[PDB]
Each structure stands twice: as C-alpha cells, then as structure tokens.
Amino acid sequence: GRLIYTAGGYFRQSLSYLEAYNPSNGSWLRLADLQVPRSGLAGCVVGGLLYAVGGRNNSPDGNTDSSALDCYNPMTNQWSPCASMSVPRNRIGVGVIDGHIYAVGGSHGCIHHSSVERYEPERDEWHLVAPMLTRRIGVGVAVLNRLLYAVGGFDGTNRLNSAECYYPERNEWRMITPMNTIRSGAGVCVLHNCIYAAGGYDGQDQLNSVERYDVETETWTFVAPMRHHRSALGITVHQGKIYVLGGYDGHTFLDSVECYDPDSDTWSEVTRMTSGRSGVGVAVTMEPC
Ligand SMILES: CN(C)C(=O)c1cccc(-c2cccc(-n3ncc(C(=O)O)c3[C@@H]3C[C@H]3c3cn(C)nn3)c2)c1
Ligand SMILES: [Cl-]
C-alpha cells in the first residue's frame, strides 16, 4: 500500500511535520519531523525514497530560505541530509525524470530564479542545467513523457499564465501554450496525458478553477473546479486520482483534502489533515516499516 506523504508547510510559522495519509483506510500517521522546519518546499520520490527540496524556514528567530535536499527512508523512519543545491529556492517546483530530480525556479530573498538544477542520487551531486526563459517562483512543475514543464508562478513583477517545457536531450526550454488563467502557487501534476493546474493566486483572488494541458493538442481545457478556493496547495496523484491538500483561501489555512475523479469530472472531500496549513510538499511512496 502506498501513502500520501505531506511534509512541512505553514501556519503562523513554518512547520516540520511529516504525516502520511492512507487512502485505503482514511488514517493518518505522524512520522519523523523534518530536521529543519520549512514551507514553500516540494516533495518527490525516487527509488522509494522521499525527498524534501528547498522552501523557507519562517520562524520567530529569523527567516531563512533553504537550499537543502533531505531524504526520508520509510524503512527506517529517518531523515538524512543530501548535498545542497547551488542556491536557496523558496516556493520551488520539482520534477523527477529517469531517477534525477529537477529543482526549478523559486526565490532567494528578492531574487526570483529562472535557474534550474538537477540532482543525481547515485553521485549525491547537483548540476545546473539551462535556465528557464522566465523567472518563476511559486512555479508548478510536472513531468509527462520524460519532458519537464514549468507552469505559471511569479516573476518578481507579475503573476504568470505562461508556461514552458524543458527538452533534456537539447538542454533547452521552449514556451508552450499559456494557460487560460493566471496562476501563482497552484498545484500542478500529471494524470494520463494531461498536465493539470489546480488553484493558485491570480493577483487578486485564490482560485478554485482547474485546467489541463493536453500535449497532443497543445490546448488547455477547464475541468470541474475544486470545492475550495486555494493557493499554496499540495498536490499529488494516487491510483489515477488527483489529491489536493491544504492551502490558503484568503481567510483560513485549509485542512481540506479533495480528490478529483477524471471519469465523473467531480471533486469530493476525502479527509482532513490533522491541522490546517499551506505551502506543503507532497509525494507518494510505500508505507513505513
Ligand atoms: C498566506 N501565506 C503567506 C501562505 O499561505 C503561505 C505561507 C508560506 C508559503 C506560501 C507559498 C507556497 C508556495 C507558493 C507561494 N506563492 N508563490 C508565489 C505567490 C504569489 O503570491 O504570486 C505565492 C502565494 C500563494 C500566493 C498567494 C498570495 N495571496 C495573497 N494568496 N495566495 C506561496 C504561502
Ligand atoms: Cl514564504
């Protein structure tokens, strides 16, 4: 059985929580805390290991953007440090291609990154690759057909409807069709042949709208909106369904988890996180121990 892991996030300050939700039975487990609290981080999995990438420790004692990569082994319930990235990356996006982790965009103070770098677990090494054509923080990232997509975000001046694609064998970024909606701090993931962008912030309002990019047709289409408006949501895919976790609706730090069924085109309430939070990192792997 596979669990949805939620790492870090933010309520009043950055959080070190790691909890796992089991869609088979509705249960949550609290597991080993992150060594350093962090929000605006991303989660991913490689070789059954869970990686926590970037973010920022918002704390009474000071605010520190994170260049960290940390690894969680469900067998041991332990976090281990890995090599750090070239630069701190708050409000990061991440994607995995052929066992390598791409860290995309994010901020370091008022620096809004276009830079992109790639982690090789077998060497414990990061290396920079071609930078994006756009500076993007709060960027959505997904992998489809071993191509890496950077969707939306904030460029230091505007929230973006734009999106682009990285072609590894050419070390080259190219723009794709822009989204119909400006989305910064959205949830972005892949399901079947489409990149989904759920929620985010458009410069005025947190969004409940959801749209998907079909690579074969190069168009974005709206699907059913989520029940909750949300920015800074976590998102993942588990057994052919999209799950969205937490975020911010202009009023509340949400504990809502919703899931999307693409065949009925419907969203439904699935569970509540143990406490409301925004800016989490999420991924799916095997259950611990
Ligand atoms: C309200 N609060 C501060 C938190 O809940 C929060 C706390 C810690 C980390 C994040 C976070 C995580 C990922 C992306 C972004 N992000 N990246 C870019 C922009 C933008 O604003 O363009 C944003 C923020 C989410 C959107 C936002 C802004 N507003 C007013 N609502 N949502 C933030 C949000
Ligand atoms: Cl922040």
- Number of structural domains in the chain: 1
List Cα–Cα distances, 68 to 78, 113, 164, in angstroms.
16, 16, 25
What residues contact 264, with CB distance under 8 A and at least 6 apart?
A: none
Could you give the 3-state DSSP secondary structure of residue 4?
Answer: strand
**Which amino acid appears at position 56 of this protein?**
R
> Which of ligand 1's atoms lies nearest the C-alpha of 250?
31
Q: Where are the beta strands (DSSP E) in 100-232?
A: 100-104, 107-108, 111-112, 116-120, 125-128, 140-144, 147-151, 163-167, 172-176, 187-191, 194-198, 210-214, 219-222
Shortest CA distance to 128 belongs to which of 154, 107, 102?
A: 102
Experimentally determined by: X-ray
Q: Environment class of residue 49 by beta-carbon count within 10 Å: exposed (0-12), middle (13-18) or buried (19+)? A: middle
Evaluate whether 269 touches 256 at the Cβ level (below 8 Å).
yes
Token digits of residue 128: 């920079």
Residue from 13, 91, 139, 159 whose mutation best tests the ligand 1 pocket (most atoms within 8 A of CB): 91
**Which amino acid appears at position 236 of this protein?**
T
- Domain of residue 81: give its range: 1-289
Token digits of residue 286: 């095997």
SS3 of the chain: helix, strand, coil, percent, to 5 = 0, 50, 45
Q: Whose CA is nearest to atom 1 of ligand 1?
A: 248
Q: Which residues sit with their C-beta closer than 6 Å to ligand 1?
A: 10, 39-40, 91, 137-138, 154, 159, 184-185, 201, 206, 231-232, 248, 278-279
- Cα separation, 248 vs 177, whole angstroms: 27
Token digits of residue 239: 């057994």
Q: How many CB atoms lie within 10 A of CB 109?
A: 10
Evaluate whether 8 touches 14 at the Cβ level (below 8 Å).
yes
Shortest CA distance to 65 belongs to which of 115, 25, 18, 14?
A: 14
Token digits of residue 34: 């992150």
Q: Environment class of residue 61 by beta-carbon count within 10 Å: exposed (0-12), middle (13-18) or buried (19+)? A: exposed
List Cα–Cα distances, 281 to 58, 61, 68, 175, 228, in angstroms.
15, 23, 13, 26, 19
**Which amino acid appears at position 78 of this protein?**
Q
What residues contact 29, with CB distance under 8 A and at least 6 apart?
A: 3, 19, 20, 22, 288
> Which of ligand 1's atoms lies nearest the C-alpha of 9?
8
Residue 208 region by backbone torsions, left for phi larger than 0, else alpha for psi between -120 and 50, else beta? alpha
Evaluate whether 103 touches 89 at the Cβ level (below 8 Å).
yes
Residue 136 CA neighbour count, 13 Å, CB half: 30
168, 172, 175, 179: CA torsion to nearest 10: 30
Q: How many whole angstroms from 15 Cα to the centroid of ligand 1?
A: 15
> Which of ligand 1's atoms lies nearest the C-alpha of 153?
18
Evaluate whether 153 touches 140 at the Cβ level (below 8 Å).
yes
Q: How many whole angstroms from 263 Cα to the centroid of ligand 1?
A: 31
Chain center to CA of 139: 8
What residues does 125 pair with on adjacent strands? Answer: 120
Token digits of residue 7: 């790492």
With tokens 């690894």, the residue in question is: 71
- Cα separation, 280 vs 55, whole angstroms: 9
List Cα–Cα distances, 96 to 7, 44, 104, 219, in angstroms.
17, 7, 11, 24
- Cα separation, 213 vs 9, whole angstroms: 27
Measured in residues, the chain has a length of 289
What residues contact 191, with CB distance under 8 A and at least 6 apart?
A: 212, 237, 240, 241, 242, 262
264, 269, 271, 273: CA torsion to nearest 10: 120
Evaluate whether 282 touches 242 at the Cβ level (below 8 Å).
no
What residues contact 157, with CB distance under 8 A and at least 6 apart?
A: none
